[PDB]
Amino acid sequence: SFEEFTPLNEKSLVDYIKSTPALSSKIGLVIKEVGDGNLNFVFIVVGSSGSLVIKQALPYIRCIGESWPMTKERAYFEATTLRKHGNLSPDHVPEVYHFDRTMALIGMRYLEPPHIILRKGLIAGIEYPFLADHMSDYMAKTLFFTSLLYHDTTEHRRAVTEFCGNVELCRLTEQVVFSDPYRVSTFNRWTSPYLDDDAKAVREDSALKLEIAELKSMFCERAQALIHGDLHTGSVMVTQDSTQVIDPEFSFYGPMGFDIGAYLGNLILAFFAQDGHATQENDRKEYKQWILRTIEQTWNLFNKRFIALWDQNKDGPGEAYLADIYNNTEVLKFVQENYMRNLLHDSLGFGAAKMIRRIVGVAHVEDFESIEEDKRRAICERSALEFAKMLLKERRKFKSIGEVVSAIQQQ
Amino acid sequence: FEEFTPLNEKSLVDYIKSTPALSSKIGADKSDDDLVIKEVGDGNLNFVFIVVGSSGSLVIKQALPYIRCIGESWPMTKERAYFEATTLRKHGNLSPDHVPEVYHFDRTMALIGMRYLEPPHIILRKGLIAGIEYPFLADHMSDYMAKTLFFTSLLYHDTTEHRRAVTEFCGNVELCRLTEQVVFSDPYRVSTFNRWTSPYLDDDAKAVREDSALKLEIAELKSMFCERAQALIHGDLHTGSVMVTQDSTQVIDPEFSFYGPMGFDIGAYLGNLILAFFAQDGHATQENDRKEYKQWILRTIEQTWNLFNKRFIALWDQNKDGPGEAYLADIYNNTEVLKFVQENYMRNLLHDSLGFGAAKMIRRIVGVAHVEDFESIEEDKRRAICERSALEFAKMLLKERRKFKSIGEVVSAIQQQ
Ligand SMILES: Nc1ncnc2c1ncn2[C@@H]1O[C@H](COP(=O)(O)OP(=O)(O)O)[C@@H](O)[C@H]1O
Ligand SMILES: Nc1ncnc2c1ncn2[C@@H]1O[C@H](COP(=O)(O)OP(=O)(O)O)[C@@H](O)[C@H]1O
Ligand SMILES: CSC[C@H]1O[C@H](O)[C@H](O)[C@@H]1O
Ligand SMILES: CSC[C@H]1O[C@H](O)[C@H](O)[C@@H]1O
Ligand SMILES: [Cl-]
Ligand SMILES: [Cl-]
Ligand SMILES: [Mg+2]
Ligand SMILES: [Mg+2]
Ligand SMILES: [Mg+2]
Ligand SMILES: [Mg+2]
Ligand SMILES: [Mg+2]
């Protein structure tokens, strides 16, 4: 099925693959649709000589249906960023085998069992000993090398031009992250009646509304790096020794803190969900401490690794901090410490915004939704929401991730 | 004229005659009268001709593939003329009384035909040097700035429109790179392009390239210049980009335009008014000591910002239910919260404006492209004394701008200098 866009299912996919040498060659069929995400269709294909994943975008948001159109052109941006981020961090992104723009279809490496979505592992109370290492490396490489710390402004502008094409998905985010939680919307939902007052407070908080508008402006305006754009714990697949970032379909030239914040923010949601998963056998007290350690280490390793790349590449081609200006170790370290403190504050801000929108908005997270009892869920959700409102408003007071972790504990 | 060819006073006659949009404006198509054509471009980049016919007058501007003031050794795409013509039309639609009308654009020839801002219009910078007051200037410039910046921002654009507009203006990258070098980089290092009144400013230039706090601020502003698509900025809005009479104010030369930070325009303009203030003692004579004129400059600065602040807010209020998505009406949903976010936005905008303004002052004093305000002070030592006061003020302002809560406080600091 090739010449015009065709929505595929488990059996027409057979014919498409057979007609596509790049894909048929990779597996030489058992087909199962397994997409549990919000937007797209994903198929595991096996395979005489191998296996693969087929992802296809339809012209609307899958979790809503046809009343919410969304260009299938997002698949092009997903494939572009899987390749670009993959080039930079090949150990942490699934290889792309094939892209068909007409079909809005991507063929890519199947992340084989025992790979699971990280969010699920966090719900299950499983520790991932390489997670802080792998994720800090991924974020450092992808954000540093697509920033003006490495790009000259000619290539940066060329890349911005390209990614302005992903405006429809940017528009989805502008609505669901930066707008809906702060107003009345038929799309919003929360554990009710428990969080009714909580949701009203969010849409009546002036200081909160100021901060979200500033972050929304930065999202819409600031071409800082090629961000993944949806870097929550549902966008990471893991085993005890493998960490793979998937689903960069929301990618564009945006603020770095949006990725770091999405990821750290979702770890913070995991932390606040834990009490709702506690049992007689596992009270989650030690696991909660592990999550806090992973948050602290992810940021601290990221900071160290990002600066290491900057130091390694201080003598071009990036033009943001020209070496004959920032020309001794003292002034360079001074400007770096400033840059990283601002990046921490941006990250906490976007992280807090993502936490808020998960609790009162259209798209919730499994960490809380898998807590069956509404009352128990609401207690955990309220703790997370109170923390997130404080963080959004007060983040510039924090000098370190250690201070953020202390604040989480005092909540 | 199917291929690009540089025009001169003689060959332009033939170009006009082959071009109905031009010949008809001046009478060349129905009269045999000789056209009177004079090349008058005194700017840094392009060639500008005044054309006078029997029945009208016009200006022809042409870009060549290099920076005029440097010569062929500094290439610069002639495609800049496309961006100039685009922004003349776009800003002109928004502030029609303060931008010259475009009659003709020829992309191949990199050529614009536009309204001749006739005598006694002179460049504002020359009027400031001459000690001429312009009673309408704060009114006109504040309105010009509020209109051009508000209506091309996310307070008015939806993000689909904004992304489309950014895509287009990313093509003006070569001129952005010129500014990235000369404004944001060269003054803070050794460069063969840098120049200053020597030896008198040698220590001052060295201090700029040794000032860590200053280097931090310029890096953050450079990042904002390179990354932040806030509005369609003119991109070169100094006092040499404004032409004036007692009752007319016209903004010219938006060739550097792109989607950048609003403060870069406001700061370019106010920063050059501040340069003019600091140059005034250098132009003083026993007959006109410039003391009253200096106070006039300070009033115009204060009035320009204060009028801009309220007029920008007025457009925001007026378009609060309009298509802009930056501050959605059902979120910022009462008059009190809207004023609260507006006040913060405008404070940040003042700080951005003061930072870019200070950056432009610094680059005019130690960099490749100086201003007539100082260069027209004949005596080197006398010029350096005025230049130093300006530079010392600009360094303070770049570093300390966030302490200022009003333009009045900035004006007091200038008076304290
Ligand atoms: N390369 C892959 N290998 C294994 N499983 C995958 C792969 N890509 C996606 N999946 C599975 O498909 C689900 C949805 O994929 P995702 O790309 O997140 O789609 P959406 O864009 O709809 O969120 C994931 O939760 C995971 O279970
Ligand atoms: N529309 C106009 N009407 C009258 N004079 C003009 C007009 N446009 C330009 N000029 C004159 O040409 C000079 C240079 O024009 P400008 O557009 O600033 O060129 P540049 O891009 O080279 O700086 C101005 O200082 C002014 O004297
Ligand atoms: C209607 S919002 C859909 C959500 O799912 C995507 O993965 C993004 O997180 C988006 O906000
Ligand atoms: C080489 S710098 C030339 C200067 O003239 C233009 O008008 C801009 O101001 C530019 O910085
Ligand atoms: Cl999220
Ligand atoms: Cl200037
Ligand atoms: Mg997903
Ligand atoms: Mg997705
Ligand atoms: Mg000019
Ligand atoms: Mg000395
Ligand atoms: Mg010019």
Numbering used by the authors:
A (entry chain B): 2 to 29, 37 to 419
B (entry chain A): 3 to 419
Paper text:
To promptly remove the toxic by-product MTA and to ensure sufficient supply of methionine and SAM, a methionine salvage pathway that recycles the methylthio moiety of MTA to methionine has evolved in almost all organisms. In this cycle MTA is first depurinated to 5-methylthioribose (MTR), and then phosphorylated to form MTR 1-phosphate (MTR 1-P). In bacteria and plant cells, two enzymes, MTA nucleosidase and MTR kinase, are required to convert MTA to MTR-1-P while in mammalian cells, MTA phosphorylase phosphorylizes MTA to MTR 1-P in a single step. The bilobal structural organization as well as the topology profile of MTR kinase is consistent with that found in eukaryotic protein kinases.
The structure of Arabidopsis thaliana MTR kinase co-crystallized with ATPγS and MTR has been determined at 1.9 Å resolution. The structure of A. thaliana MTR kinase has two subunits in the asymmetric unit related by a non-crystallographic 2-fold. The nucleotide binds in the cleft region between the two lobes of the protein. In the A. thaliana MTR kinase structure, two Mg(II) ions assist in the binding of the ADP. In A. thaliana MTR kinase, MTR is bound in the higher energy α-ribofuranose anomer with the substrate's O1 hydroxyl cis to the O2 and O3 hydroxyl groups. The O1 and O2 oxygens of MTR form hydrogen bonds (~2.7 Å) with the carboxyl oxygens of D238 of the strictly conserved HGD-motif; while the O2 and O3 oxygens of MTR forms heteronuclear hydrogen bonds (~2.9 Å) with the guanidium nitrogens of R365 of the strictly conserved twin arginine RR-motif. The G-loop of A. thaliana MTR kinase has an extended conformation, with interactions formed between N46 and the O4 oxygen of MTR. A consequence of this extended G-loop in the Arabidopsis enzyme is that it shields the active site from solvent, a feature that more closely resembles a eukaryotic protein kinase active site than that of the B. subtilis MTR kinase.
